[PDB]
Ligand binder design. Structure first.
Ligand code: HEM
Length: 411
């Protein structure tokens, strides 16, 4: 199939997470050609594609996504555009800081933070879950990475991280908010990187600030103070991004009352399942980009070298070939499902040790289960009349009212 139009890019902006889905349905196929971002593309959807997309003997990420995304979300020349053993080397670094012990540590700081906020929320009129999340995560993330953060600095930093996430799929004021935030974080963090290297800021072995400051590339030399910031930022920023998911976690519990007592009567497993369903059902990761390395043939289609390709993450997550009533929130669909690396890919697919799959899936899940465990057991509240609606054309997406809470009371 081939969309011959000459503005798919503007269209993509109007449809968002449904852009690829809208055409893999129309053209009745798992992939289609289009003209996106100045280049010739091939958008594909589905787990079988994911399997091919993550085949690095066929796909490279270098030169894949536009600079505007680097200049607002990832940073210029960060791990995201890396390929080969160079990428697997920088990648083992992120993993070392995202292991079960850490996850455990992070969910733990959040738990007390959550419990501590209650005394404050019980006195407020309202509370905007998205705003409470932004701060706490930011304050915790730093603490955990060993990055210093003054109380009167949390908001600004918490906000700068988010302006970066909220810019990747936008044009105009929204894009710029992040084209300006980025330069402020890098600056801020590149200083600590330099201070660490001077033994002027205390750093503790095994924490992101330490490991980034002292990492060693294959050639044996260390990262430019600037790149180490960007890389430490690609740890801090993502954790603050868990704000979205957390707002969705609450939102589901509201729109799906029945699942409340379900969780409350259950254990960690009921949570684990309610979380995994939030990561699958709700929009966040739009898709991914890559360049075809060698000319190959798959699904009767010819992929020419240098052709650009988008992997629909949202669509693979809602494809009936892999899920019953994919557009239904059903925590149970996860009871007994064997673990897989391509059926569900909300934070990427395949191996994290062999590819670009998010290495923060553990932390994201662990942090989310905690957040939920709190909303369900520690407090009781009211969801006052508001705008919970969330668009699928806007990327990223979020319940308009940031999810307002009221009459919060200890449980
Ligand atoms: C809050 C929700 C999160 C979402 C939806 C998310 C989503 C994703 C996606 C879709 C990718 C790309 C996969 C690919 O390119 O093939 C990725 C990469 C990555 N994520 Fe996340 N992420 C999240 C949380 C986290 C957390 C909290 C951390 C840090 C602890 C983190 C660290 C990273 C890193 C550094 C990479 C780049 C890996 C590479 O390029 O090889 N993330 N993530």
């Amino acid at each position: 199939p081939h969309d011959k139009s000459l503005d798919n890019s503007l269209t993509l902006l109007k449809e968002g997470y449904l852009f690829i889905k809208n055409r893999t349905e129309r053209y009745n196929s798992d992939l289609f050609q289009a003209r996106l971002l100045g280049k010739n593309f091939i958008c594909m959807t589905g787990a079988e594609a994911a399997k091919v997309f993550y085949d690095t003997d066929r796909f490279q990420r270098q030169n894949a996504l536009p600079k505007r995304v680097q200049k607002s979300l990832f940073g210029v020349n960060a791990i995201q555009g890396m390929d080969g053993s160079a990428h697997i080397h920088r990648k083992m670094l992120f993993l070392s800081l995202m292991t079960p012990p850490h996850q455990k540590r992070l969910a733990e700081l959040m738990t007390e933070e959550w419990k501590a906020a209650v005394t404050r929320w019980e006195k407020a009129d309202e509370v905007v879950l998205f705003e409470e999340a932004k701060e706490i995560l930011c304050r915790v993330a730093c603490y955990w990475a060993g990055v210093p953060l003054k109380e009167t600095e949390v908001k600004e930093r918490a906000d700068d991280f988010i302006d970066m996430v909220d810019a990747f799929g936008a044009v105009g004021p929204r894009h710029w908010k992040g084209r300006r935030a980025r330069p402020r974080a890098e600056e801020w963090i590149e200083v600590m990187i330099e201070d660490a290297r001077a033994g002027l800021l205390k750093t503790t072995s095994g924490t992101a600030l330490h490991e980034m400051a002292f990492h060693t590339q294959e050639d044996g030399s260390q990262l430019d103070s600037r790149m180490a910031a960007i890389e430490l930022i690609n740890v801090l920023r993502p954790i603050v991004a868990i704000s979205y998911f957390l707002v969705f976690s609450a939102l589901a519990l509201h729109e799906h009352p029945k699942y409340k007592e379900w969780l409350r009567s259950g254990n960690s497993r009921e949570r684990e399942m309610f979380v995994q369903e939030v990561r699958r059902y709700y929009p966040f990761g739009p898709f991914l980009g890559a360049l075809v390395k060698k000319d190959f043939v798959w699904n009767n289609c010819e992929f020419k070298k240098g052709t650009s390709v988008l992997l629909d993450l949202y669509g693979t997550n809602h494809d009936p070939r892999l899920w019953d009533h994919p557009d239904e929130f059903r925590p149970e669909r996860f009871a007994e499902r064997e673990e897989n690396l391509f059926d569900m890919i909300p934070q990427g697919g395949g191996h994290a040790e062999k590819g670009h799959r998010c290495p923060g899936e553990g932390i994201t899940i662990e942090v989310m289960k905690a957040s939920l465990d709190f909303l369900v057991h520690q407090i009781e509240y009211d969801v006052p009349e508001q705008s919970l609606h969330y668009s699928l054309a806007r990327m990223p997406s979020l319940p308009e009212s940031g999810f307002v809470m009221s009459g919060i009371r200890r449980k």
